[PDB]
């Protein structure tokens, strides 16, 4: 097999760390009479990294 | 309803076997005609679409809502409008001039009594060219029309 959708040098190596998240995630949340959707942004790395 | 009279003149001298004729010819002329109702009845088939009786109307007796979200009172004329993707009828009020013409009613009045004329002409000729070989020439014509173009 040949890996697909790999961006960068083929000899690249990275330090992978798999942690247990300590931040509860929800798909939606009730508001002032309405059920708004929950959105997670690309700049929230600090929030998930601190609550590990 | 269709009431027509047809008269046809034919001349055939072919022979001898009807399956494989070797000589003769067959000429036929036909004409089917219907009474010219348009001449006697004083009805304008061209202005039918511009009359109140041939415009779309709401025959119900309960106030309803059209595709536009407005009231459609009983007896008011209607028109077809396409709001967003779907399409539906929209009340136009008493302005029948702006309503949609009822094609079904116009066609019904136009074709309540069939009025037309049909003419058919056919010519068939058989002849022996060489030995048992025979040549057949066939020419057919057909015309359908109306007394009033309107």
């Amino acid at each position: 097999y040949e890996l697909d959708s790999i961006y960068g040098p083929a000899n690249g190596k990275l330090k992978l760390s798999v942690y247990e998240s300590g931040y509860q995630m929800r798909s939606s949340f009730p508001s002032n009479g309405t059920e708004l959707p929950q959105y997670y942004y690309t700049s929230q790395n600090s929030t998930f990294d601190q609550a590990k | 309803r269709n009431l027509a009279y047809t008269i046809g003149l034919s001349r055939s001298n072919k022979g001898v076997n009807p399956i494989f004729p070797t000589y003769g010819s067959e000429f036929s002329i036909s004409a089917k005609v219907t009474p010219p109702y348009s001449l006697f009845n004083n009805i304008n088939y061209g202005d039918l679409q511009n009359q109140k009786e041939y415009k779309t109307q709401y025959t119900g007796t309960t106030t309803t809502t059209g595709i536009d979200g407005q009231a459609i009172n009983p007896g008011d004329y209607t028109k077809t409008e396409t709001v967003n993707g779907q399409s539906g009828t929209v009340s136009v009020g008493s302005d029948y001039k702006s309503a949609d013409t009822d094609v079904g009613k116009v066609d019904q009045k136009k074709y309540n009594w069939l009025e037309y004329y049909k003419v058919k002409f056919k010519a068939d000729w058989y002849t022996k060219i060489y030995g048992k070989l025979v040549l057949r020439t066939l020419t057919e014509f057909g015309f359908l029309g109306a007394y009033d173009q309107s």
């Binding site: 300590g22 931040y23 509860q24 995630m25 929800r26 798909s27 939606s28 949340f29 009730p30 508001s31 002032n32 009479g33 309405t34 059920e35 708004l36 609550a51 | 106030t63 309803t64 809502t65 536009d68 979200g69 407005q70 009231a71 459609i72 009172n73 008011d76 009340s91 136009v92 009020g93 008493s94 302005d95």
Partner: protein
């Protein structure tokens, strides 16, 4: 074999009156022989959990029935629910009353509940007859609001008697709820699942639900732009539709209460809402070029609204509500008020208190020519 017979023997359908009497007796016996203990965790998820235990020391054990129409919480109340021809009576205990609004019988409720079903066990040779409560479902952490319109009749009748509470999100993503309504509702089999028995709950089994109303979500079932809580003609707080012969064999005398047009369709489920022909959505739609927009929405709200801080990318400020009949000056002093010369809106038509909104008045939109 090849034939397909249709022999449905679920025709029994135990009499509504007989089943209700049996369930009521079982529920009453449970309320007299059992007592409840309630936790008191202030901010934990077990803030108002209830534990039912048999009464073996009636000297100092106040039974659930002891909490009758008491003037102090906990209070056990009775709500008359007329349905199925008979008059159902549902017992519900209010351990604590919330410090917020109350949801309608057809609104969405964000709550955590633990349900159990009551089933009288036959007296065995060595064990005497008694009542047992078996657990069937529980939701400790609510995620989505439950529409009370589609839930059992018991929920839609008891929930409007409770209130919501405040909710705060902790730094770790968890949510902390406080000052919320909590209580246990004893719903008979008729108002719950009557004869279904498909789920773990056996057929004709009274249900006991321990609810904790965290929040509520206003819903609109007719999509007319007016929410169900605002389409309640009376101040009862309940909206009913009597178009179901199974639930209402004969329309009661209280009909037409939440129906302005008297067409049989309640306003919360009707689009016209007044019989004038013009839909409610069109009537509340902001006309083009009006001098009283007051917001970014294309539909006039029932009452003035304010922005939502929870929504920082949208301003919900709507300073104008659904207007009443125009009480301004005519386009032309001559001629009578009609479609040709319409009356202009002053300003107070969108803010007066007690005004007849054009969506409930069948004479404003004007006749078409």
């Amino acid at each position: 074999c090849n034939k397909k017979d249709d022999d449905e023997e679920i025709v029994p359908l135990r009499d509504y009156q007989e089943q209700y009497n049996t369930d009521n007796a079982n529920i009453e016996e449970y309320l007299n022989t059992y007592f409840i203990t309630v936790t008191d965790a202030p901010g934990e998820q077990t803030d108002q959990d209830v534990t039912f235990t048999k009464i073996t020391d009636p000297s100092t054990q106040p039974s659930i029935m002891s909490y009758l129409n008491s003037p102090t919480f906990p209070k056990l109340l009775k709500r008359e629910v007329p349905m199925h021809g008979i008059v159902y009576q549902m017992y519900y205990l209010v351990l604590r009353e919330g410090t917020g609004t109350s949801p309608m019988n057809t609104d969405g409720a964000f709550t955590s509940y633990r349900g159990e079903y009551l089933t009288r066990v036959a007296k065995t040779d060595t064990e005497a007859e008694h009542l047992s409560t078996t657990f069937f479902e529980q939701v400790l952490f609510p995620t989505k609001a439950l529409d009370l319109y589609g839930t059992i009749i018991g929920w839609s009748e008891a929930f409007p008697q409770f209130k919501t509470g405040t909710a705060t999100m902790k730094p770790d993503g968890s949510m902390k709820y406080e000052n919320f309504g909590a209580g246990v509702l004893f719903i008979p089999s008729g108002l719950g699942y009557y004869g279904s028995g498909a789920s773990a709950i056996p057929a004709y089994s009274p249900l006991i639900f321990s609810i904790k109303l965290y929040d509520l979500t206003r819903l609109d079932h007719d999509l007319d732009g007016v929410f169900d809580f605002e389409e309640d003609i009376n101040g009862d707080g309940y909206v009913y539709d009597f178009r179901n012969t199974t639930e209402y064999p004969t329309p009661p005398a209280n009909q037409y209460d939440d129906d302005t047009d008297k067409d049989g369709i309640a306003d919360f489920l009707d689009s016209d809402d007044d019989g004038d022909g013009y839909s409610t959505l069109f009537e509340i739609t902001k006309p083009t070029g009006t001098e009283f927009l007051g917001g970014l929405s294309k539909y006039y709200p029932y009452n003035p609204v304010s922005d939502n801080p929870a929504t920082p990318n949208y301003d919900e400020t709507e300073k104008y509500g659904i207007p009443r009949r125009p009480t301004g000056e005519l386009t032309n002093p001559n001629l009578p008020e009609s479609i040709n010369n319409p009356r202009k809106f002053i300003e107070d038509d969108y803010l007066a208190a007690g005004r007849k909104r054009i969506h409930l008045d069948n004479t404003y939109p004007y006749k078409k020519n």
